[PDB]
Amino acid sequence: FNLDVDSPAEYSGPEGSYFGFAVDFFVPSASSRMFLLVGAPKANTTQPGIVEGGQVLKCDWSSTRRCQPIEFDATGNRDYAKDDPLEFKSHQWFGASVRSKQDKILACAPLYHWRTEMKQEREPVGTCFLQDGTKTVEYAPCRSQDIDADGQGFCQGGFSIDFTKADRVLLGGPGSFYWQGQLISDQVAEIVSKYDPNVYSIKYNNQLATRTAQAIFDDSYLGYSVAVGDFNGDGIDDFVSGVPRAARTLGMVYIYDGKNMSSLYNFTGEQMAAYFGFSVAATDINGDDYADVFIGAPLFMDRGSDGKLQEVGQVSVSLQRASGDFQTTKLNGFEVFARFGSAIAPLGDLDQDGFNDIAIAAPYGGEDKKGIVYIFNGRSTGLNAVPSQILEGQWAARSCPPSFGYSMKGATDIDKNGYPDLIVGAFGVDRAILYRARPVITVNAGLEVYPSILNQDNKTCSLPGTALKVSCFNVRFCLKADGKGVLPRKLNFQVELLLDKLKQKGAIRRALFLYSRSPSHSKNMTISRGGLMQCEELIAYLRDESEFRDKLTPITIFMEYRLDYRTAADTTGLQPILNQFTPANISRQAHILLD
Amino acid sequence: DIQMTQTTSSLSASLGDRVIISCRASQDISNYLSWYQQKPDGTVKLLIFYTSKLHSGVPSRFSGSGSGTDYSLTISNLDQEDIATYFCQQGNTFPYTFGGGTKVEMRRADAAPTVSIFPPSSEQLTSGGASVVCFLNNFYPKDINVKWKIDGSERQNGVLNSWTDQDSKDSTYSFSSTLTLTKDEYERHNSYTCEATHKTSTSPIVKSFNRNEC
Amino acid sequence: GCALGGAETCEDCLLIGPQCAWCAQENGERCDTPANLLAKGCQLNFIENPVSQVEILKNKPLSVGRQKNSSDIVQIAPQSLILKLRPGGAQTLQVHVRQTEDYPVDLYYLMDLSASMDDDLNTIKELGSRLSKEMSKLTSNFRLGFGSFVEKPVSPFVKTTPEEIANPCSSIPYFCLPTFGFKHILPLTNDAERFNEIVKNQKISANIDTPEGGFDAIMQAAVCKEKIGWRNDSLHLLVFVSDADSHFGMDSKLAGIVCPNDGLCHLDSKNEYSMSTVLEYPTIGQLIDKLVQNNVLLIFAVTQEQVHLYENYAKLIPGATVGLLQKDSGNILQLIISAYEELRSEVELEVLGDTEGLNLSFTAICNNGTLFQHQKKCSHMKVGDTASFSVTVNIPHCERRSRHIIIKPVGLGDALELLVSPECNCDCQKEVEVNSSKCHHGNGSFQCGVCACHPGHMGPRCESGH
Amino acid sequence: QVQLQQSGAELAEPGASVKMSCKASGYTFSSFWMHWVKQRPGQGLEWIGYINPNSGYTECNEIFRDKATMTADTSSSTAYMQLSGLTSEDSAVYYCASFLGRGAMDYWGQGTSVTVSSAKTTAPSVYPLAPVCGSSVTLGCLVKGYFPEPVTLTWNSGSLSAGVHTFPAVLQSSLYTLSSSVTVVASTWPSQSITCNVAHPASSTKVDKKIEP
Ligand SMILES: *[C@@H]1O[C@H](CO)[C@@H](O[C@@H]2O[C@H](CO)[C@@H](O[C@@H]3O[C@H](CO[C@H]4O[C@H](CO[C@H]5O[C@H](CO)[C@@H](O)[C@H](O)[C@@H]5O)[C@@H](O)[C@H](O[C@H]5O[C@H](CO)[C@@H](O)[C@H](O)[C@@H]5O)[C@@H]4O)[C@@H](O)[C@H](O)[C@@H]3O)[C@H](O)[C@H]2NC(C)=O)[C@H](O)[C@H]1NC(C)=O
Ligand SMILES: *[C@@H]1O[C@H](CO)[C@@H](O[C@@H]2O[C@H](CO)[C@@H](O[C@@H]3O[C@H](CO)[C@@H](O)[C@H](O[C@H]4O[C@H](CO)[C@@H](O)[C@H](O)[C@@H]4O)[C@@H]3O)[C@H](O)[C@H]2NC(C)=O)[C@H](O)[C@H]1NC(C)=O
Ligand SMILES: *[C@@H]1O[C@H](CO)[C@@H](O[C@@H]2O[C@H](CO)[C@@H](O[C@@H]3O[C@H](CO)[C@@H](O)[C@H](O)[C@@H]3O)[C@H](O)[C@H]2NC(C)=O)[C@H](O)[C@H]1NC(C)=O
Ligand SMILES: O=C(O)[C@H](c1cc(F)ccc1[C@@H]1CCC2(CC2)CO1)N1CC[C@@H](OCCCCc2ccc3c(n2)NCCC3)C1
Ligand SMILES: *[C@@H]1O[C@H](CO)[C@@H](O)[C@H](O)[C@H]1NC(C)=O
Ligand SMILES: [Ca+2]
Ligand SMILES: [Ca+2]
Ligand SMILES: [Ca+2]
Ligand SMILES: [Ca+2]
Ligand SMILES: [Ca+2]
Ligand SMILES: [Ca+2]
Ligand SMILES: [Cl-]
Ligand SMILES: [Mg+2]
């Protein structure tokens, strides 16, 4: 609920380059500046003779908002012989996937084709580049001697990638073994130490890889998507991967052990061709330190009040439990054909309430297919089924839909304000947007009405002026505030009180405030973080019995407190926001004595 | 098939020397030529591939050069563990073919063989048959010939020979020659002689005995 | 019962319940059952209670027997109704359907032409004449067309070497044409020999991954009404003939195609699907949308290995059916006739239009009064038999805009136009009577026997002032 | 840390067949071809063929097209070769070598020796060799007529290593014959006893022979 949508950071790339198809954060391992990594897989490069080789850009944060390409590889196609290229980098879609662990940056070209040494072929084995510091090495685990559809010739390695917490690379290629798909995991230490540019198929030791299986599993697309998380409690991150065509298009999600690639758990979709497994994510959403699985099925069709199927998408949320089971719940989209669930981005603890949160993208929702991103906050029971915020894209295109939200990445506090921030990509408009998280003010309010029971015959107060003999009672509203992170010490609240609120317009109001002789009383206040309960009292009174013949319904004292947000800003320009989960209104009710 | 030929089947070098091994192909192999080291125990290691590329782990001393049909391996600062046989192999077309191999031996000052002749054991004679054994040990260079003379005549029929790999401590070789006969044929003649012809001397070294005598 | 909290206005009273009414002038809580209001004084001329009602605009009788004139065919009755609905009240419409004896039939033969369908081409050299001759016994207006599909001609779904591009079977060797997405070859026509000739001139293509791109071809065949040649007021049979599963949705992402299908016709000058390499495969939801919108009935004629998959697809697609195809299409004629006969043997209702948020109940009554079932389809009926349907419609809450809705049989063009209009206002509401004496000297307006007070005046008759 | 472990020596009669293994470790066995090489005793290297382990596809030199058959077990990362219709020309050492790429083979097994003869297991006859009736003295030991290889020979239980020249075995009427010479100081024999220790494991043979005269 606390993301700043009024003035987000906006980055642009070359038109038609799909700038924003992939997004990530960059955290150089020197506590240095932070950057944004943005993939532009159709961008033209200076590589000799290469058309739309693609590139990955590093973007400054708020220093200039400038992006510059990262030089992973400045060369063209190697030659097996004169006029006989060894590889084909044009339209290789370099940057279709980008992942960054501390210094390391991993970017891949899932449509890189390579000839072979035996015969003139064009096989999309895919390739990746890993840059640590000055060191940059090529990582093409599927560029083996296992040539063809039957082998890994069409593996498209790098289609999806991730880093484990122990500096292992998780990579997926959906084309291996007649599109059964494949997962491969290699130690970054191996990837760099064993690199030899003279060797096209590098023998990495300690490599983990799924194996070819029976033909019944063909065309399953294992490795279409990947995520990492521990699911046997041994501290070793395990491999989650979507398999969207498995189970005769019901879709599946495989989990393999991150130590030996042994199969651990399986998920299966519920509807044909829902693309169950298009996206997967792993993050502990309920604070039990057990990673929870999120699975997207952006084509899942719901049933409507009229009984009509409507394609809205669906996300499954599977809470891991110590017993090894999973506690699953579904989450349906809101707009037809919006493809809710195409992207699922762990956000860390966005509102810093103690539970991790998550963003789910409907890249083709909103007005004119401008895309929508939903924010879901976590809690002890699981994920809050109602989104606490809705992010909309402001940009429209004319060739391919903006796809705002097609890619996302959160869980990084780029402005060091104490709250994680979110990157949203929109490759259809060659745009990438950074949303910064505003600090959250938890507010403790209180309202006391004494005496509670009121006797009209009782009269121990006097009205303003010479008027006398009115029944009265006291009201004492209180307010207290605190917060986490970069916040000012002083806060200017606006409180309002209303007596006999429940009576609708055109109905007599029995209670009035003493001074104002009106049922409403406004008030500006000022409180500091962690400060004491700042209170204030005033007196209210009842009208004469002759003016109202309703002595049955109770009299509610309503209190509403609002905060002028602009005054409590920060050097960032980032205003705080009131905790949306604590209601900003409280009410106590008094009663009329009867005899 | 591509014919790989290593003209020099064997060469001698000293520690620290530069050794260059040649290899020629019957056709242009487009630099797809590799070099392998085989040590006397049968162990095989890859040294060079694609004519100049060091395989992971092999020392910088080894280097490759060439193009078209002519290629060569180079060992600068030859080490003691470099004494081995070296094969070239073309990989440009199937079937993969190897060169005959070039053998690198340590250099040494010429030495004369210590030759010893032995009569057939009494155990063997009771079995029938008699073997006369001649040991010619610790000589350099390797080339050496042996001739068996019984009564001044060359038998050249039942002789079997065996050589040792070059010794490591010293750089010498050794030779075992065994003339096997029947007990009858052995007991028919009296003298038995083992003649060695080595380059270390123009006069063949001779060792002999007389069956009757003792 | 209907005098619960709130309900202080006639409009507010009407909203709480469908059977509640309002009173005028009390010759409190007037909201209650009409009988109670009459019991407590509210006279007939003053009580206010709107009720759901139906107005029949077009109810031409169903046509009986074969019609020589296409304009006298009536297969659904009524044809136009107005439904005025009180919020929370339900009305049950009676809809009668009857299939005419002679009804034109369009059939588009959409065929997988990957390498495994070479034998299939050889056994259907005279399908056009055989099929049209058997259909002549059933309908006097049968037309048929032809189209073919293989696959999106991009990597990684095809070999992309020059030799394989020019001839994707050059490695066999065998003569195959370069891979293509969808070729619309023959628009719908009655010339069956023309269908035979084109089939005889067809050559196979090939590709490298088993799932084929026929869903692209289905989309184009359903949407391109003019180029395909679908005519109004006739059956639209799209016969999908393949021996492999189908790519769908974001499968194309492997080829770098990440722009969703747009459900528009994209047949170029060569009558080839031009967006094959540009747009994703259609999703099931997208195909459903355009198949229903274009009144196209899909027939999956697939081999044994694929039946279970396509049957599951057919469960989702309205009107879709599946037939078991031999490995050489030797029985395709029998499949088509069986599917057609089953279609002429059924009547399934379909509700299209602005139906989101509406509650609908369907009770199907076939075999005149003998059988009642809570479905939207009647089966096992002879042509000429009539299938009746009770369609109950309810609007939960009040709305402003009216809803345009169509009720039609699946596969037929005959449609019942239905306009659902809300009635959650009272007749007394229109007589404002502003600044009336009955509300404390013009301090309010007398609307329905109650004072609606002006701002700053609270009370039953606006007698106290803020 | 790539290692190719090949099976032990094979013996077979003429016309029979043998099957040898090659277990790989240190790399993903399925992603790299396995080559096989033949080397006759004292001869050069001969390329047999290769196999794609994950697909079973093979290519052979025209020579061995009917001689050798290559297979692979992926679950155990093991390549196999079977030599059928054996002759004496098939007696040789057979190596397995992983495919580097670039037309080279980067890692080699230790080799599996194959021996093809009709002879059956035979124990050795150990004969002492004393000189005929002077600073150093050369004694000898003749191990004749055993099968199969190997035989182990030591002098005084291996106490005498320097000055020992044990020669490789030779074929002799289809049986192995081996000899060894030991050289000691003339004053240390026959004052001290020198014994030829011979062991033929294939025959559970252990013989100790002394050199008296
Ligand atoms: C691929 O790798 C897998 C992981 O390395 C491996 O699975 C391992 O297999 C071995 C042998 O089969 C098991 O060792 C055996 O353990 C049983 C009893 O184990 C019980 O106790 C251990 C000890 O608990 C401590 O460690 C855990 C870390 O996981 C801590 O959280 C805990 O607090 C303790 O400090 C426990 O780990 C085991 O828990 C596993 O299994 C249970 C039951 O399925 C799960 O609920 C749990 O999540 C976890 O998966 C278990 O309670 C003993 O009787 C045997 O004698 C032997 O010592 C390993 O435990 C096991 N490790 C796992 C499953 O994580 C696969 O075998 C391997 N596959 C292949 C083909 O190589
Ligand atoms: C999660 O789901 C995946 C996908 O369904 C599943 O992987 C598959 O598991 C099966 C079963 O282990 C694998 O099939 C096996 O393959 C081996 C090697 O070919 C066979 O030897 C096995 O045969 C044995 O079991 C048969 C059972 O009918 C017996 O008939 C037979 O005689 C043998 O005893 C067996 O067929 C299959 O290869 C994998 N596929 C992939 C892509 O990995 C996985 O097991 C599931 N895991 C969990 C935890 O649910
Ligand atoms: C990167 O540079 C390449 C060229 O180096 C750009 O591609 C070229 O520009 C457009 C592609 O958008 C092509 O023009 C179009 O051609 C088609 C077919 O002829 C025609 O239908 C259109 O009307 C238009 O004329 C041009 O052919 C193409 N040339 C190639 C691909 O060789 C590309 O757009 C650049 N990309 C970015 C992101 O800057
Ligand atoms: O539909 C087409 O056009 C062609 C075609 C059909 C023909 F009847 C005849 C010829 C073809 C084309 C011709 C051109 C070609 C050579 C280049 C490709 O083949 N199908 C599409 C896919 C392909 O099926 C392969 C799945 C076979 C299932 C399988 C087998 C083996 C394993 C595994 N799985 N799992 C991995 C491990 C081993 C053939
Ligand atoms: C019937 O065809 C006419 C033109 O021939 C077209 O305008 C009309 O839209 C078609 N029917 C419907 C219901 O649209
Ligand atoms: Ca783990
Ligand atoms: Ca959890
Ligand atoms: Ca949170
Ligand atoms: Ca932040
Ligand atoms: Ca067929
Ligand atoms: Ca296909
Ligand atoms: Cl064919
Ligand atoms: Mg096909």
Side-chain angles (χ1 to χ4, degrees), chain C residues 116-120 243 327-328:
Chain C
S116 61
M117 305 292 292
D118 189 76
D119 52 321
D120 298 67
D243 66 356
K327 308 301 175 57
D328 59 3

Side-chain angles (χ1 to χ4, degrees), chain A residues 18 21 42 93 110-111 113 120-124 148-149 154 156 159 174-175 178-179 219 221 224 244-245 248-249 271-275 278 298-299 301 304-311 337 339 342 364 399-401 406 427 504 506-509 518-519 547, chain C residues 8 155-161 163 208-211 245-261 280-281 283-286 288-289 305-306 308-309 312-313 316 350-353 355-360 453 457-460 464 466:
Chain A
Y18 286 9
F21 190 84
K42 280 191 174 180
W93 276 68
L111 277 171
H113 310 65
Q120 265 183 59
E121 305 285 353
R122 182 178 177 275
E123 295 196 347
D148 207 334
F154 291 69
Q156 296 185 267
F159 192 83
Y178 273 110
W179 292 269
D219 308 310
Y221 291 179
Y224 198 101
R245 284 190 57 86
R248 299 301 276 169
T249 70
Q271 179 178 105
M272 290 258 159
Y275 235 96
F278 182 85
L299 312 183
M301 291 181 294
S305 170
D306 53 7
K308 265 190 187 308
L309 282 173
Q310 40 188 14
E311 182 182 304
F337 294 131
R339 298 198 176 172
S342 298
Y364 310 103
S399 66
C400 188
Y406 193 90
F427 75 88
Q504 295 281 81
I508 310 159
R509 281 170 171 164
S518 68
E547 304 186 348
Chain C
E8 292 180 349
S155 194
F157 305 136
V158 297
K159 288 297 188 62
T160 44
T161 67
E163 297 82 353
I208 62 182
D209 75 328
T210 285
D245 52 329
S246 290
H247 278 304
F248 61 97
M250 298 78 84
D251 284 353
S252 72
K253 178 174 157 83
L254 300 196
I257 301 176
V258 290
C259 309
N261 195 276
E280 300 175 341
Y281 301 95
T283 77
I284 274 59
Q286 291 176 315
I288 292 173
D289 196 71
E305 295 78 2
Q306 306 291 341
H308 186 250
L309 176 70
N312 283 116
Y313 286 157
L316 309 172
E350 213 185 7
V351 180
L352 291 66
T355 57
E356 263 295 337
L358 272 178
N359 307 132
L360 304 171
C453 295
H457 291 87
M458 301 173 178
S464 64
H466 178 198

